[PDB]
């Protein structure tokens, strides 16, 4: 019998690997700074749930540009820095992908090439794609030989792509393979970049996170800004707050006068408004909250060095379990590698024994979370792949 | 010598928002009979922000279970919040729910499900990647709906007739004529209840004249309901239309807001409903959404969701949100049924009962905008240049002087 086809009928059908920190007891972990703040705020009957402005909470978009920045900035001095609130590190690189693809280079120019890293966290390419972005391109980084950064590689890329192109650069422990830069190597990379009128858009989620150390952690998004570059940086608050579900975030934006800083987020506002019309209050009220108060920031701190050093710990026993079970390879890159995640140097092939043979679960890519590991467990996997190594 | 200039120093600065503008001046104003009637959100007759008791209840609740993470939530977001949003707009015994051909998708708000909802509707409705089909907003409506649709990639946004200022109502003939004449397939925004800006709505007799116009010409309802419960007071009344169209058989998006029923405007609560005329076709919907929220915000926020699925899934806490939904529902209409009757009191010049007509919080009143520029410059009354005000600006105690207010700018000011 007759019927009227549904609108959807032709949609079609879209088509160790734990992605968060976990205790040695491998658990979710909610940092102890998190839950006081949150009582306190449950309990503090005179706050309410009205609109916060367009481009969000005035406290904690100052507070998490400071953190990335650091209080002595000259930008903050000079007054040349913006920030945008944004839903969390994904939020803020979506705003500023749809910002540049308006303003930059020319109005509503979706021509200027994009480059990531090869390879990088995979939504960099989808978001950028999205906000309209026609050519994007990657840049060298990880050398599968030498399990190591390809630095002449990376500046090779950086010396042949067009002026003005954007670079999405991770701030700190690099994901998915943990491989940074050092600051000799960085200070190569901002003399390319300056030279080629390249503009750095800085991925930060693991501040403080990757050494334990917000200082240190921040130190190359600091040194562009000496440098007198202008630059975004997407801020996460996901994994150093823990705060991955309540969608944090902060767009931090440089400019070379604090004029421009004006128009630049007149324009932001109008962008927000249409994605998600102002942004939510749970999560940013808490990091402002523990940014603002100087023993709750020292808490905070005690906390994500916490997280970092269980991480540092899997890592030098994981290298030097391996490395005393005489297993095959160079494994100083375990230990070189910072942050949570770590290209193992294994095959696809490897990986099979791996998932198949052994039950240990982790990417084709060879990718390892290190908080997937205990002490319970640290051994257990160090020969199942002194295991695969050898088979 | 020379620095190099920014790479912003071409970027222009964005004009402002009236609104924002209105807002400022009003606080900038020492008279103390000054009145704010263009707030955008509920207030008591105290002129406070309102958090509900319920939700301050469910707040503490959440402070004190041990048991809750902030790991990351699925990528469409919480299943309980997802489900128990759905079933209010539906109802529990709606037919698509029994025939499980209904999705649901968390989103930042009311404006994040239409954002969500209108890149769908760009990439895969009426073929693929287009742009072309016409989206029809009604004249005058949210000053965002434009924005969101046309940031989504559609360049063909037109209006179909819905005020009408000589009448002070709804110009049914003209919207039915602007149905009649759309091209198949076209997309309409259409506002579920209280309408925004002007509070006037189609009597059920009337939605019924509409539907049936977009049934035989394939048009899409795409329905937006930020006001359910908050409107009439009566949750089921409010969403009349929406189920009254799932049962004559409609494929449809529904845009809900939590942001006024729950008072939870900066937690973003909102939620895409989806309803499909086959069951396998909303997996297939809900992996493109996936997709697209992934892009977007990729996954949404926990606090709000968790607070509306606790309040939604427990009959104590139910009960109590459906009396505080009441309460500010009942404050609205004693505001208008007080205003009206001061305006004829004063024997004003023309007819009033649109001010009891209308529903919600926002009133188109008539006004034009010489007596609107009166009320500001001489009373402190501040309200929209066109002739909108919020219902929640009103008080007890400044009804007089607004009535009194209004009947001058309406006699003095021709």
């Given at each position: 019998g007759?019927?009227?086809?549904?609108?959807?009928?032709?949609?079609?059908?879209?088509?160790?690997?734990?992605?968060?920190?976990?205790?040695?007891?491998?658990?979710?972990?909610?940092?102890?700074?998190?839950?006081?703040?949150?009582?306190?705020?449950?309990?503090?009957?005179?706050?309410?749930?009205?609109?916060?402005?367009?481009?969000?909470?005035?406290?904690?978009?100052?507070?998490?540009?400071?953190?990335?920045?650091?209080?002595?900035?000259?930008?903050?001095?000079?007054?040349?820095?913006?920030?945008?609130?944004?839903?969390?590190?994904?939020?803020?690189?979506?705003?500023?992908?749809?910002?540049?693809?308006?303003?930059?280079?020319?109005?509503?120019?979706?021509?200027?090439?994009?480059?990531?890293?090869?390879?990088?966290?995979?939504?960099?390419?989808?978001?950028?794609?999205?906000?309209?972005?026609?050519?994007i391109?990657?840049?060298?980084?990880?050398?599968?030989?030498?399990?190591?950064?390809?630095?002449?590689?990376?500046?090779?890329?950086?010396?042949?792509?067009?002026?003005?192109?954007?670079?999405?650069?991770?701030?700190?422990?690099?994901?998915?393979?943990?491989?940074?830069?050092?600051?000799?190597?960085?200070?190569?990379?901002?003399?390319?970049?300056?030279?080629?009128?390249?503009?750095?858009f800085?991925?930060?989620?693991?501040?403080?996170?990757?050494?334990?150390?917000?200082?240190?952690?921040?130190?190359?998004?600091?040194?562009?800004?000496?440098?007198?570059?202008?630059?975004?940086?997407?801020?996460?608050?996901?994994?150093?707050?823990?705060?991955?579900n309540?969608?944090?975030?902060?767009?931090?934006?440089?400019?070379?006068?604090?004029?421009?800083?004006?128009?630049?987020?007149?324009?932001?506002?109008?962008?927000?408004?249409?994605?998600?019309?102002?942004?939510?209050?749970?999560?940013?009220?808490?990091?402002?909250?523990?940014?603002?108060?100087?023993?709750?920031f020292?808490?905070?701190?005690?906390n994500?060095?916490?997280?970092?050093?269980?991480?540092?710990?899997?890592?030098?026993?994981?290298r030097?379990?391996?490395?005393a079970?005489?297993?095959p390879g160079?494994?100083?890159?375990?230990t070189?590698?910072?942050?949570?995640?770590?290209?193992?140097?294994?095959?696809?092939?490897?990986?099979?024994?791996?998932?198949?043979?052994?039950?240990?679960?982790?990417?084709?890519?060879?990718?390892?979370?290190?908080?997937?590991?205990?002490?319970?467990?640290?051994?257990?996997?160090?020969?199942?792949?002194h295991?695969?190594?050898?088979?």
């Open positions: 007759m019927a009227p086809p549904s609108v959807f009928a032709e949609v079609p059908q879209a088509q160790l690997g734990v992605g968060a920190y976990r205790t040695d007891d491998c658990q979710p972990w909610v940092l102890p700074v998190v839950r006081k703040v949150e009582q306190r705020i449950a309990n503090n009957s005179s706050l309410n749930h009205e609109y916060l402005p367009i481009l969000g909470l005035a406290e904690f978009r100052t507070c998490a540009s400071r953190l990335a920045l650091g209080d002595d900035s000259p930008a903050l001095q000079e007054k040349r820095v913006g920030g945008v609130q944004s839903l969390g590190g994904t939020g803020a690189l979506r705003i500023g992908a749809e910002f540049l693809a308006r303003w930059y280079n020319g109005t509503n120019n979706k021509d200027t090439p994009v480059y990531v890293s090869s390879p990088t966290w995979e939504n960099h390419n989808g978001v950028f794609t999205t906000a309209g972005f026609k050519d391109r990657s840049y060298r980084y990880w050398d599968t030989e030498k399990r190591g950064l390809d630095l002449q590689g990376f500046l090779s890329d950086l010396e042949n792509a067009p002026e003005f192109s954007i670079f999405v650069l991770h701030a700190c422990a690099h994901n998915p393979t943990g491989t940074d830069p050092t600051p000799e190597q960085w200070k190569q990379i901002a003399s390319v970049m300056k030279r080629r009128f390249l503009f750095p800085f991925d930060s989620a693991y501040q403080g996170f990757a050494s334990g150390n917000l200082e240190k952690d921040a130190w190359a998004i600091r040194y562009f800004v000496s440098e007198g570059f202008e630059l975004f940086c997407a801020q996460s608050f996901s994994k150093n707050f823990g705060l991955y309540e969608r944090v975030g902060n767009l931090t934006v440089v400019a070379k006068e604090p004029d421009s800083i004006l128009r630049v987020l007149s324009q932001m506002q109008k962008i927000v408004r249409v994605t998600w019309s102002n942004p939510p209050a749970q999560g940013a009220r808490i990091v402002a909250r523990t940014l603002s108060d100087p023993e709750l020292h808490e905070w701190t005690g994500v060095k916490t997280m970092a050093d269980r991480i540092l710990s899997m890592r030098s026993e994981l030097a379990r391996l490395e079970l005489k297993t160079t494994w100083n890159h375990i070189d590698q910072i942050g949570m995640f770590s290209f193992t140097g294994l095959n696809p092939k490897q990986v099979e024994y791996l998932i198949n043979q052994k039950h240990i679960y982790l990417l084709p890519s060879g990718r390892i979370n290190m908080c997937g590991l205990t002490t319970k467990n640290l051994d257990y996997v160090a020969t199942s792949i295991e695969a190594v050898t088979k």
